[PDB]
Structure formats: C-alpha cells, structure tokens
Structure 1
Amino acid sequence: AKTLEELATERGMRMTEQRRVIARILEDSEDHPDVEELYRRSVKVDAKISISTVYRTVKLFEDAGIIARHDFRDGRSRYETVPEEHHDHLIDLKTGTVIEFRSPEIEALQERIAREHGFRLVDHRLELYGVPLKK
C-alpha cells in the first residue's frame, strides 16, 4: 500500500522532513488544498517551512506526476493525491474549498445521453459550484 512520500522517492525526488510534512498534509486532506492552505497547515507543524518550499514541493510533485492540479473557476488552484478512483467536484464558492462526489446516478445518465445523440462516452468534465444553504 503506497503512501505519497513513498510514491515520491519512487520517481527520484529529493525528500526532506519539510517535504514529508507537506506530503502527509496533502495526503490527509480531502478538501483539495491550494498552495496557501498547505502552507498554513504545514507551518502550523514545522515553523521553519516557507511558502517558497511549499510551492517548489508542489510543482516538483506535479513534475513527478504524483499529484493532480485542478483549476476550478472559484478562485484557487487545487491539488490532490492522484485519486485511485474517478470522482467529480463540487466547489464551495464562499470558502473555495472542494467536495468530491461520485453519483453513479449521474454517470449512467451521462452515459445514456452520449447514446441519445449517437455516442460512446469517453470522458467528461463535471464541476458544480454551490453556496452554503441557510439552515
């Protein structure tokens, strides 16, 4: 069973303690943090960590292909550990944070409309943008 720092070294990345920290945070997160939120969380644990380190680390993870970058039109470049299974995204517009979902209801529905117009579905991009409901 592969962890992310374990999965980094596999692709010849120079890890340090600071990067393992940053790797553990990202791994542990299900909200797909941007660079800035990883920083705040990381610095909370290792105060020596710079924004410089976190940006480079992320960009280097991205070159290793061990994370997925997402540019949603919320207001943030969101990052996650490559998902073992596909899912879609819902974005809180108030806080910019991200919620993953797999509705196979929707998957099937998308699968069927491809057909209705004469198509086998090969890919899709599905993004939802919500505001929090009042109570």
Structure 2
Amino acid sequence: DNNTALKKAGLKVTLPRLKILEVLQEPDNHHVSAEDLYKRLIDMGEEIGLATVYRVLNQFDDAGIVTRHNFEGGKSVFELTQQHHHDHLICLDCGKVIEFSDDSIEARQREIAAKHGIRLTNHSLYLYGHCAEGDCREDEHAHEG
C-alpha cells in the first residue's frame, strides 16, 4: 500500500523511504520538522542519519508526495499532501503546528464566496497565537485537547 503510492510518485521503494512515510502517517507526526522526524526515527532505533532524512523529504516534495511549509518563518515543516482537509493552528512560543477542521467554518466560507459571485475552490487559514498559561516550551502536553 505504501509500496504502491511510492511508485505512483516515481520513487524506488527503498526502506528509508518506507520508514519515513510510516513516521509521517503516525498521528502525532502529521506536521513534523525534518529533525523531529529524525528524532522519532532514532527513538524507533533506525540508524538513519539526519542528512538522509533531509535528502528523502526533499525528494518526496518534488514527487508531490509531501508539502513543505515555513509556518514559523524559518523552521521548515513537512506533511503528507494526501490527507483529509485541515487548517493550521501554530504556537508562536514553541513552534507546534496543530491541525484542525471546523465544518461550520468550511461551510460559511462557501457561503461568503457564493454571496460575491464566487464558487470557493481553495483557501488557506493560518491561526497564530501564544500559549495561554505557563510555558508550553516545557509541557509537551500543552497543545493536546
């Protein structure tokens, strides 16, 4: 299955490719920096250097497998292009990118475009803010509902 999608993009089905795909399918890691991906890759105990993680993730974007984005101006973050629709809530103190989908917003967005003669075809919604209490740079649980 992962084997099939890799070929559909144009990449030979190596193990480090299949292993990075599997980290990008974990729920905690739908939005992950190249390094945090390597941090996960070494917790699972894969001898896969950080330079190779960069190598592969860049190749994946070329083949439309993943989208990169600099939500923090600097820190690049990668996600599986093939995913259900969500928008992005980003914490400005610790860098955490949180996904979310609101059906009443996606609906009003269609309603607002249709009021002005427009059929909504794409949109981007980025939320930015600060940790409400304490310091999220310590509590890894700070941004989980």
Distance 1:78 1:111 in 2: 28
Length-normalised TM-score, structure 2: 0.76
Q: How many residue pairs get matched?
A: 133
What are the ranges of 5 or more consecutive residues in structure 1 without an aligned counterpart? none
Pairs within 5 Å for 1:1-135: 2-3=1-2, 5-29=3-27, 30-73=29-72, 75-134=74-133
- Name the amino acid aligned to 1:127: Y
Q: Please tell me the root mean square deviation across aligned C-alpha atoms, in Å.
A: 2.3
In structure 2, relative to structure 1, the CA distance for the partners of 1:32 and 1:11 (3 Å cut) is same
- Name the amino acid aligned to 1:105: S
In structure 2, relative to structure 1, the CA distance for the partners of 1:47 and 1:111 (3 Å cut) is closer
**Identity between Structure 1 and Structure 2 (%):** 40
- Structure scoring higher RCO (CA < 8 A, sep ≥ 6) equals 1
CA contact (8 A) 2:41 2:48 kept: yes
Length-normalised TM-score, structure 1: 0.81
In structure 2, relative to structure 1, the CA distance for the partners of 1:53 and 1:103 (3 Å cut) is same
Distance 2:104 2:45 in 1: 43
What are the ranges of 5 or more consecutive residues in structure 2 without an aligned counterpart? 135-145
Cross-structure match for 2:137: none
In structure 2, relative to structure 1, the CA distance for the partners of 1:10 and 1:130 (3 Å cut) is same
| 1:40-77 deviation digits (Å, cap 9, x = unpaired) | 11123345311211011101111221122223245422
